[PDB]
Amino acid sequence: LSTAILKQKNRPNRLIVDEAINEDNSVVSLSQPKMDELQLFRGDTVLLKGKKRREAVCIVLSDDTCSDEKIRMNRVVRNNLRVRLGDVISIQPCPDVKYGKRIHVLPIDDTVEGITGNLFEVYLKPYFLEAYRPIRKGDIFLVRGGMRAVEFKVVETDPSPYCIVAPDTVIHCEGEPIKREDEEESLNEVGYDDIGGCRKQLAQIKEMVELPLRHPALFKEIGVKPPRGILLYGPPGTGKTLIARAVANETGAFFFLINGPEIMSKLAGESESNLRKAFEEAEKNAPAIIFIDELDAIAPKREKTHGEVERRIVSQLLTLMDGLKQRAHVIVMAATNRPNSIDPALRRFGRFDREVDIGIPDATGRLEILQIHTKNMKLADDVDLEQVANETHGHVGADLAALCSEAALQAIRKKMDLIDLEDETIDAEVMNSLAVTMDDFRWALSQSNPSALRETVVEVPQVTWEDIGGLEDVKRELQELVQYPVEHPDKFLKFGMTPSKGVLFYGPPGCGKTLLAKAIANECQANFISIKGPELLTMWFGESEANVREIFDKARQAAPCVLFFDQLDSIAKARGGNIGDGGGAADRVINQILTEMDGMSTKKNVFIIGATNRPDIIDPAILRPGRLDQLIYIPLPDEKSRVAILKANLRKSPVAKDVDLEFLAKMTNGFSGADLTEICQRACKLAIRESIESEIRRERERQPVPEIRRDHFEEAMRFARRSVSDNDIRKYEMFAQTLSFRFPS
Amino acid sequence: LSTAILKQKNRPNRLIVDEAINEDNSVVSLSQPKMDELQLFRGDTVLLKGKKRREAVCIVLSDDTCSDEKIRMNRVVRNNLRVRLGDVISIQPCPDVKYGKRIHVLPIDDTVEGITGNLFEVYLKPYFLEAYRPIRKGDIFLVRGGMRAVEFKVVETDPSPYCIVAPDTVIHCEGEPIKREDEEESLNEVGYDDIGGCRKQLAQIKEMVELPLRHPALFKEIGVKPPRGILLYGPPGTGKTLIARAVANETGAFFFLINGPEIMSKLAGESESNLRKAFEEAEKNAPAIIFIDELDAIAPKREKTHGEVERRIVSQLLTLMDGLKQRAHVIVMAATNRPNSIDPALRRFGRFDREVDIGIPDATGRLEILQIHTKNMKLADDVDLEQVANETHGHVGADLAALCSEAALQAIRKKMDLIDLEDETIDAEVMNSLAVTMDDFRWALSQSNPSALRETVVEVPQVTWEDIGGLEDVKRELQELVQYPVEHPDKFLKFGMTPSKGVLFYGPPGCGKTLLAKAIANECQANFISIKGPELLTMWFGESEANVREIFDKARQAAPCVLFFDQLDSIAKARGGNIGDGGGAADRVINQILTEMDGMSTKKNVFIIGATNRPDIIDPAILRPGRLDQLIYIPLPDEKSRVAILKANLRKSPVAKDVDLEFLAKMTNGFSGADLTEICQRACKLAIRESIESEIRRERERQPVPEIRRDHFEEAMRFARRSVSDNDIRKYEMFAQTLSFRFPS
Numbered sequence A, B: 001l002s003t004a005i006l007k008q009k010n011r012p013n014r015l016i017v018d019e020a021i022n023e024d025n026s027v028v029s030l031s032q033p034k035m036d037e038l039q040l041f042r043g044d045t046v047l048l049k050g051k052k053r054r055e056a057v058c059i060v061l062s063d064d065t066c067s068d069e070k071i072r073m074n075r076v077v078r079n080n081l082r083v084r085l086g087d088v089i090s091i092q093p094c095p096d097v098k099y100g101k102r103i104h105v106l107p108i109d110d111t112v113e114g115i116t117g118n119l120f121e122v123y124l125k126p127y128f129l130e131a132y133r134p135i136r137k138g139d140i141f142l143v144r145g146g147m148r149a150v151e152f153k154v155v156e157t158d159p160s161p162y163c164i165v166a167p168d169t170v171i172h173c174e175g176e177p178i179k180r181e182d183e184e185e186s187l188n189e190v191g192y193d194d195i196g197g198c199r200k201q202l203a204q205i206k207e208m209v210e211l212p213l214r215h216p217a218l219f220k221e222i223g224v225k226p227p228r229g230i231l232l233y234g235p236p237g238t239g240k241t242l243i244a245r246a247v248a249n250e251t252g253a254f255f256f257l258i259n260g261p262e263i264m265s266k267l268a269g270e271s272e273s274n275l276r277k278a279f280e281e282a283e284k285n286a287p288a289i290i291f292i293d294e295l296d297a298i299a300p301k302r303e304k305t306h307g308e309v310e311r312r313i314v315s316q317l318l319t320l321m322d323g324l325k326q327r328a329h330v331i332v333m334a335a336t337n338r339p340n341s342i343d344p345a346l347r348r349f350g351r352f353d354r355e356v357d358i359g360i361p362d363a364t365g366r367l368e369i370l371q372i373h374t375k376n377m378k379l380a381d382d383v384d385l386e387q388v389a390n391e392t393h394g395h396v397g398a399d400l401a402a403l404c405s406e407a408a409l410q411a412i413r414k415k416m417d418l419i420d421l422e423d424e425t426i427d428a429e430v431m432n433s434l435a436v437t438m439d440d441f442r443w444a445l446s447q448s449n450p451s452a453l454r455e456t457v458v459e460v461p462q463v464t465w466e467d468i469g470g471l472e473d474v475k476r477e478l479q480e481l482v483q484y485p486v487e488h489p490d491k492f493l494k495f496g497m498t499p500s501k502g503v504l505f506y507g508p509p510g511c512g513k514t515l516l517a518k519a520i521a522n523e524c525q526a527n528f529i530s531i532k533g534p535e536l537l538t539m540w541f542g543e544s545e546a547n548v549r550e551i552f553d554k555a556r557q558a559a560p561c562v563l564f565f566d567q568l569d570s571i572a573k574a575r576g577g578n579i580g581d582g583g584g585a586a587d588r589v590i591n592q593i594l595t596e597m598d599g600m601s602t603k604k605n606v607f608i609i610g611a612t613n614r615p616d617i618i619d620p621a622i623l624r625p626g627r628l629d630q631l632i633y634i635p636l637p638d639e640k641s642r643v644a645i646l647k648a649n650l651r652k653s654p655v656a657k658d659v660d661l662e663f664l665a666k667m668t669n670g671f672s673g674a675d676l677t678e679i680c681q682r683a684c685k686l687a688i689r690e691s692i693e694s695e696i697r698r699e700r701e702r703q704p705v706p707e708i709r710r711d712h713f714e715e716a717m718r719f720a721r722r723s724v725s726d727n728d729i730r731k732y733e734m735f736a737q738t739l740s741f742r743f744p745s
């Protein structure tokens, strides 16, 4: 499975973090069956591993009230392992822990601010007297006594790293106090849990980076060599640098970070020296990871570069990439937001040959990002991260971070009156009053401008079959065409028939062709790419055929994908229709589409769908085998289908049950689904106007309309008119006709 | 609220500057309830803070004639705090002011010009004998005695900064006299009060620059990180450098100024060293502000740059921007008049991610600029800064400064006869006679050429509903469509209807579609962007579709905004109308408009309005949902509406009450609003010609017409003719028609 590597295992060592009844900063409690399963004795020293490279040592004890799958755990060592209640930690035996020869500790600034007494005698000596506490370098532990409990950081141990505080162990705390800034920076370091909406990408990165270095013998045994170059790409602000930081803080391998402007800001001969030194340092500390952030800064296209030194730097990078012998256990990672700007030589074999797309997050992904970014943010109960996530189409993670910052700024604006710039300090009542409400998020949404609105949307559509009324035979035919090869390929192989991978929807406008394409993409849970008429017209007017290939390339990277071409006749009408131009049924954009379809015919998991309201003026070459060779007529709905359409459109609108949708459908004989949606929208508009006017009337008098009613629908049927005439219907009929026989008995 | 930070608070310490009855240069007087509220004793030394970083010390005394909210204040210490009568200052206790050990003072040049006696004995000793005056470094104080009072500047104090002049304090005044040029430069330093028309921008700058450095704990508590990079952009002469100077003179943080030509004029390796030294200096003196004026000079687009050293400088700037850790408390500000010319990498996250638009001022803003620039200018009573401000469309602050300079030059030209170049001095009668009159401003206006006339105008229209006659149902429909979603969004959410965000006005020409768009923009107080037919035609002829997106980008930065597309049929007529060309209802510019409308559909506070006189030849794709899907017919006015139109057009023209506008309206059956305006304009022209000829006749005889009359309107009705024929009206009628039913009982 694609994300099977992200699965952490149901193992006896894995334990759920639980609160501690009576536990000091040196012990943890487990259930007796858990010690029996783990062969752990009471009083044994045990090593605990948690999130973000964190390790600690404790004393394992028995607790009859402790669950088998849980470990009792006080707050101090929870802070040490950077874990919260309900998190999962790993417990192992920690043998051969020797008595400490000498330990150097340092207090935290605010815990010692105002403390002038002897730290040793007041705090450390009673805390470490006849206790034999196990400690680790970098541990943070809180000590009682004095007027005020003081937190200390174990900055040095001998023997290292783990030592027992014996009575003869020399403890000293003389040195520069550990500042709170360092502790906060260490606490807020980025791990994998700080990335949202990139579950596929995280799994792929672990498979291609962490796994080969973690277990090289795994790939050696099966006789394959792991890729050497992984290139992260995506639009700016998608989290490539954040993923780099997470990998750096989460990896056991040696990590070296290289920035583009880092290298390019140095003098000629120092950039090359730094690059070579980085590669040599990685090779010396194998297994190692080299991350080159902003690769396009150092390696643009060599021919399109004018600097001599720049070309020399690109050549040096190519040579260093080729210098790895696949036993150096060095994996080079790179991030760029302009993958095309990279020199193509770097994308060859033995180089950055693997590519991971950190794309634009969907609604679930951006909800995850919002939850991550607001986890340490003071919020109110009215804040619905659901609603913000649904309303932030086109936002990337950086845009969502800016949105949260602007919401907080609006929250501060709401308290501006109690806050003065000239004031040396801010009252604590204002401080604890400060919270980010839903109104602040709404204002930030109103003021936010997304950076990825012009990017092509590649996602699974929300439209399902309940969103479509009628068309049951069309639904069954689409399901067969798209899913039978997927679900029963052996049946197609047995009869020797290659399935058709292209369908054209044709019919009157507003009958559900776009809905059908979206729904068939949704049922298969495949990505959906929609190319509308204005985009084809943009390529036609600008004479920019070459962009068509780009579209198909996206469909390849997004497979399984449904490539949908809506309004294939847009260029045909733009030329004037059937008799508009002297030329006949051949244009540049559709020609490139034909070539790209022929190229895509070998990609099994990309299904191409076309839609047109004017099948007569469509280029016939698109209906040839290997192209949209299946044809489905989407007709005007009949009365039952019209009832279904009216019911589907009114699901989200409160409608009184006295309204009879069957009569509405039977009276709208020649109406399309779009016309019925227009009727429903106008009825809702009338109801909203009535409710607003009634609320205004009451708001005046002090100084109704809960549902749409039958009079609303009648007043909507004033303006309702059928968009498709009988002429058009008949034209589709002779198109369908122009698409008895028995064997002798 | 957006400008809530600019609100300075109603606080007891805040005091209105008032004149002093009997106060020396060392005391201030307050009301007894004010001391009781502030817990201030009589004789206490008090610190006073004013505009432009100014501080001073005085002795607080009681005055029964002093108002509670006012402080009595002599002229000398008003000059010290750089404040005038009616200004607001802050008063606080100033404890632990020690006796001065040694003070060094220096006189002002003209106050000591011609003074050869001992300054100490004549002036300072009687002024500081048994007085115990509190003084500050940099104080300016005037001393009596001699033949002539002398101003002195306290250039050194010990102890510093505040000291008491004790009897044993050693006062000396031996040194280079403080020149008047230095004092004048210090006096005329730019503060926030020197910027006009940038109230939003000043509030935003204080929120994003002054606030994070002022109170970092405010952002730390709410768990957000303040932006690191703020980029000021706008057309040249809008005051970005002036805002930089104001921030430098108004900020408590350390300020470092970097200029583009500053850095780029140095040799290779010295520019980079200066940039790194600036960043290190800012980090050492945190909190600090780095301002990089003319950022485009040092950081153009790297690919579009050919210099090796230039690319290295851009990379170094990127590295320095990334080097900040958000605890360095360093905020980097930059100003550029070519924001697109900036390398895009500098506009990413962790870099110049916030942008403030110092745009073209409106009439109120340029009135503020004129008042600021002429505050120290000798003006006459006929000068109406109102009238200059209304007449300077397209002017930026620099243009207004040049206008004032040219007006002063014309004033000097008017006195040229009494002024000779060869003269060694100019008579004082000419000096005090020199004043800038309204005629000088009129001449400067005639000779002024604005630098921002070709920029897109983004402002709230002056047109209101009184400016429009009739169209009451259209006014109500527009108000509903535009304001009901804004005022009552919960009603739309309850019924599940997404409001239409696009309307198309159609009808005969000259009936008020542009007026309706402007008025609906004005009622909501939203920005208005008008795209006329010639602009669309310019994009069509030049095949420059890509500029359309620019327009929509403006609408995003100006939200809440009304985007108005006037004469959508201009390209359609240019192609020849309905049958002009073989192609049908599809062109490049309207195609880009469709794509941009689809992109803008997610921006709630941008409303798009289209207008056309030929709805038949409009591309139908623009009427689809998500586009201008609402349609409003603006018909020819009826008789009552024509009376209203004639009344509205004649509001600003003196009309005799014998004129009957009802008869004019009833006789002009098929006239449009433009035709009625033509009639009114021709009548005014006839009246003006009559009045001019009568004035000429009297001016001849020596060596009438106060209002428009009925004969004027009759002679105008000579040439008045209806622009719209019945053919066109009927065409609109079958367009409207082509846009009984009851539920069963």
Ligand SMILES: Cc1cc(OCc2nnc(SC3CCCC3)n2-c2cccnc2)ccc1-c1ccc(S(C)(=O)=O)cc1
Pocket: A481, A482, A483, A485, A486, A488, A489, A490, A492, A493, A494, A495, A496, A497, A498, A499, A500, A501, A521, A524, A526, A560, A561, A562, A604, A605, A606, A607
């Ligand atoms: C069995 C088969 C399956 C196939 O592909 C299956 C498939 N997977 N995803 C998709 S679509 C994607 C998923 C949902 C939306 C997008 N498909 C697919 C392909 C074509 C039509 N429908 C479905 C191709 C070709 C064949 C075969 C049949 C016969 C022969 S032989 C030797 O001439 O006898 C050779 C090859």
Ligand SMILES: Cc1cc(OCc2nnc(SC3CCCC3)n2-c2cccnc2)ccc1-c1ccc(S(C)(=O)=O)cc1
Pocket: B481, B482, B483, B485, B486, B488, B489, B490, B492, B493, B494, B495, B496, B497, B498, B499, B500, B501, B521, B524, B526, B560, B561, B562, B604, B605, B606, B607
């Ligand atoms: C309530 C709502 C308001 C809105 O926007 C309000 C708005 N603010 N400024 C403007 S315009 C600007 C101000 C004056 C001139 C320019 N508008 C606005 C937008 C559209 C039409 N009229 C006004 C958008 C969309 C909605 C909504 C309705 C229903 C649903 S749901 C879940 O399907 O039920 C979802 C969303």
Ligand SMILES: Nc1ncnc2c1ncn2[C@@H]1O[C@H](COP(=O)(O)OP(=O)(O)OP(=O)(O)O)[C@@H](O)[C@H]1O
Pocket: A194, A195, A196, A197, A198, A235, A236, A237, A238, A239, A240, A241, A242, A243, A335, A336, A337, A369, A372, A396, A397, A398, A399, A401, B348, B349
């Ligand atoms: N998927 C995500 N989950 C959580 N936070 C994210 C995500 N994507 C971006 N962010 C946040 O938004 C910002 C994006 O900055 P980051 O450096 O990670 O982006 P980038 O794509 O590497 O940048 P660029 O391509 O412009 O160099 C960071 O503050 C990061 O924490």
Ligand SMILES: Nc1ncnc2c1ncn2[C@@H]1O[C@H](COP(=O)(O)OP(=O)(O)OP(=O)(O)O)[C@@H](O)[C@H]1O
Pocket: A467, A468, A469, A470, A471, A508, A509, A510, A511, A512, A513, A514, A515, A516, A611, A613, A637, A644, A645, A648, A649, A672, A673, A674, A675, A677
């Ligand atoms: N069968 C249907 N069930 C539900 N809604 C429908 C149906 N047919 C049409 N509609 C509605 O009509 C509108 C447009 O439908 P859609 O985009 O799928 O049509 P189309 O055939 O591609 O034609 P067009 O060129 O008008 O877009 C939407 O509001 C959609 O909900």
Ligand SMILES: Nc1ncnc2c1ncn2[C@@H]1O[C@H](COP(=O)(O)OP(=O)(O)OP(=O)(O)O)[C@@H](O)[C@H]1O
Pocket: B194, B195, B196, B197, B198, B235, B236, B237, B238, B239, B240, B241, B242, B243, B335, B336, B337, B369, B372, B396, B397, B398, B399, B401
């Ligand atoms: N809003 C304003 N209020 C007051 N004075 C202004 C304003 N805008 C400009 N000025 C004045 O006009 C001149 C504009 O020069 P300034 O250096 O401030 O402009 P700029 O926009 O930074 O310049 P450029 O973009 O060409 O570098 C100055 O003399 C300034 O005092």
Ligand SMILES: Nc1ncnc2c1ncn2[C@@H]1O[C@H](COP(=O)(O)OP(=O)(O)OP(=O)(O)O)[C@@H](O)[C@H]1O
Pocket: B467, B468, B469, B470, B471, B508, B509, B510, B511, B512, B513, B514, B515, B516, B611, B613, B637, B644, B645, B648, B649, B672, B673, B674, B675, B677
């Ligand atoms: N109802 C009206 N009330 C007042 N003035 C009106 C009215 N209708 C038209 N006018 C006048 O007609 C002139 C042009 O009007 P406007 O620009 O709004 O019309 P339009 O419908 O957009 O047509 P056009 O293509 O002629 O500009 C202006 O002088 C305007 O004052």
Ligand SMILES: [Mg+2]
Pocket: A240, A241, A293, A294
């Ligand atoms: Mg990055």
Ligand SMILES: [Mg+2]
Pocket: A514
């Ligand atoms: Mg559609």
Ligand SMILES: [Mg+2]
Pocket: B240, B241, B293, B294
């Ligand atoms: Mg400047």
Ligand SMILES: [Mg+2]
Pocket: B514
């Ligand atoms: Mg007009």
